[PDB]
Amino acid sequence: MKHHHHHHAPSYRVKRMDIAKNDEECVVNAANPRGLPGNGVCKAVYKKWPESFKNSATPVGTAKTVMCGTYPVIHAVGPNFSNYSESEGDRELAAAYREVAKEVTRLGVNSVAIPLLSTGVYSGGKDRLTQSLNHLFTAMDSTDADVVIYCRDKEWEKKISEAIQMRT
Numbered sequence: 001m002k003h004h005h006h007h008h009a010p011s012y013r014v015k016r017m018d019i020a021k022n023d024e025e026c027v028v029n030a031a032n033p034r035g036l037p038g039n040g041v042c043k044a045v046y047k048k049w050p051e052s053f054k055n056s057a058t059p060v061g062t063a064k065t066v067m068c069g070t071y072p073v074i075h076a077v078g079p080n081f082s083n084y085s086e087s088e089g090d091r092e093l094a095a096a097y098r099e100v101a102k103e104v105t106r107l108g109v110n111s112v113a114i115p116l117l118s119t120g121v122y123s124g125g126k127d128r129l130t131q132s133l134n135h136l137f138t139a140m141d142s143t144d145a146d147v148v149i150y151c152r153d154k155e156w157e158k159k160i161s162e163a164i165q166m167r168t
C-alpha cells in the first residue's frame with residue numbers, strides 16, 4: 001500500500017516549457033497509436049526517452065507505460081479529431097485520460113508531468129484547451145499525485161492557470 005509524506009497535499013500546477021525537461025517522477029506522452037516518433041510533444045519525448053518506445057503501440061483511448069531505465073513514460077493516445085466525429089472523439093479523449101489516472105495510481109508516483117491530449121496536430125484545427133483540460137481534471141481529480149501540466153503557448157498558460165486557480 002502507498003503512503004505519503006505528512007506534508008503531501010495533492011496539487012495542480014502549469015508550466016510553459018518542454019515537457020522533456022520536467023521535474024516530476026513520470027511523464028505522459030501525447031502518443032500516437034503506432035508508437036512512432038511523431039512530432040511536437042511526442043517527438044520531444046522520443047528524443048529524451050527513446051528506449052520507452054519499445055512496444056509502446058496501443059489503441060486510441062488507451063495508455064501504455066514503458067520504462068526508460070526506471071523512469072516511467074505513460075504513452076496516452078488521444079483521438080485525432082480529423083478522423084473521429086466530435087461525439088466519438090470526445091469519448092475517446094476522456095477515456096485516454098482515465099487510463100492515465102489508472103497508470104499513475106498503479107505506479108505509485110508522487111508526481112506526474114502531463115500535456116493536454118489532442119490539442120496539437122490531433123485537434124482537427126480547433127482550439128480544444130477547455131475540452132482537454134476538463135477531461136484531464138475529470139480523470140486526475142481522484143488521484144493524489146502532484147500534477148504538473150505542460151504547455152507551450154503563452155495565452156494557453158494563462159487560461160490553464162486561471163482554470164486551476166478558480167477551483168481553489
Ligand SMILES: [Ca+2]
Nearest residue numbers: 059060061092
Ligand atoms: Ca478506443
Ligand SMILES: [Cl-]
Nearest residue numbers: 016017018021
Ligand atoms: Cl523549454
Ligand SMILES: [Cl-]
Nearest residue numbers: 032033036038
Ligand atoms: Cl500519428
Ligand SMILES: [Cl-]
Nearest residue numbers: 118120121122
Ligand atoms: Cl495532439
Ligand SMILES: [Cl-]
Nearest residue numbers: 151152153156
Ligand atoms: Cl500549448
